[PDB]
Design a binder for this molecule. Structure first.
Ligand SMILES: [Ca+2]
Ligand SMILES: [Ca+2]
Ligand SMILES: [Ca+2]
Ligand SMILES: [Ca+2]
Ligand SMILES: [Ca+2]
Length: 318
């Protein structure tokens, strides 16, 4: 079902490639082209082996050498590509929190689209890497029901997918109806519990029954009933429940649709999803936005940056 755009290289030789990267950096200037062409053709696993051979061959640190040679978004793109998979989300999260400011957009985006299984691993990796509890970090940096919704999600305790119980579907749709539209105010607590913990297959039926019952799609009520980060969060959750690929295909489009580009988001979704479901994200981007992801990056980016992005992404037509 899920398909990424980057796979393991067939005639892979970690040593052969490490020497190519060395020649490509040794001397005056850089062959950014040989780097980008090499690195976006190996899986993340292979990039780690290559980084290993390099150290053992030259006693130098690949990532630190690149940081020296490259600059701008390209550097940032290659540095994210070098990050081990099991660590990247953890890394992005820690970087969204830390500092005097928080990038709720990152928190929301990652915590809402990742599965319980992925949340668990992300929680481990975070603690072993920065020696901090992820939850404790989030709690400390957020508040309100937004914080609560994130913590509910960080539990990665979403109910399992079993045979759907109609009566139970009816009950949940009517409860959301009473918690929001039929209420003077909102019972955010009921939305959080039902959206945060019910099984995916169950909530998809609840979303449909709720439309039938209210004349509204859950998204419109959320927008009607809530505001700020909590709104964004819940929209995020509802969207991922319906389809992670589509939700990610959407946060990408809005990163570029605007005049400039949000390179940070553009880099994070393509890199993080390159070997999971970036192929699915592409289809859903064409269907829903009429253009292929390719063509879109092709016009919003440039330089080697643009060159690497397009190779990782691939597919002119989608
Ligand atoms: Ca050099
Ligand atoms: Ca630099
Ligand atoms: Ca209301
Ligand atoms: Ca609103
Ligand atoms: Ca643009």
């Amino acid at each position: 079902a899920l398909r990424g755009t980057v796979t393991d290289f067939s005639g892979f030789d970690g040593r052969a490639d490490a020497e190519v990267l060395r020649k490509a950096m040794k001397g005056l200037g850089t062959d950014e082209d040989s780097i980008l062409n090499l690195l976006t053709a190996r899986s993340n696993a292979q990039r780690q082996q290559i980084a290993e051979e390099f150290k053992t061959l030259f006693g130098r640190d690949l990532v630190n050498d690149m940081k020296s040679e490259l600059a701008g978004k390209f550097e940032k793109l290659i540095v994210a590509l070098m990050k081990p998979s099991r660590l990247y989300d953890a890394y992005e999260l820690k970087h969204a929190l830390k500092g005097a400011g928080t990038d709720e957009k990152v928190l929301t985006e990652i915590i809402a689209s990742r599965t319980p299984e992925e949340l668990r691993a992300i929680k481990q990796a975070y603690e072993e890497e920065y020696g901090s509890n992820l939850e404790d970090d989030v709690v400390g940096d957020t508040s309100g029901y937004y914080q609560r919704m994130l913590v509910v999600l960080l539990q990665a305790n979403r109910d399992p997918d079993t045979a759907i119980d109609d009566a139970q579907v009816e009950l949940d749709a009517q409860a959301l109806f009473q918690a929001g539209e039929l209420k003077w105010g909102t019972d955010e607590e009921k939305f959080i519990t039902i959206l945060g913990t019910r099984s995916v297959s169950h909530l998809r039926r609840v979303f449909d029954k709720y439309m039938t019952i209210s004349g509204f799609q859950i998204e419109e009520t959320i927008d009607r009933e809530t505001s700020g980060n909590l709104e964004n969060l819940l929209l995020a959750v509802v969207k991922s429940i319906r389809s992670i690929p589509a939700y990610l295909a959407e946060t990408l489009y809005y990163a570029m649709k605007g005049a400039g580009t949000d390179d940070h988001t553009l880099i994070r979704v393509i890199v993080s999803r390159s070997e999971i479901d970036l192929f699915n994200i592409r289809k859903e981007f064409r269907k829903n936005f009429a253009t292929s992801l390719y063509s879109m990056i092709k016009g919003d980016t440039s330089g080697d940056y643009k060159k690497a992005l397009l190779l990782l992404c691939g597919g002119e037509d989608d």
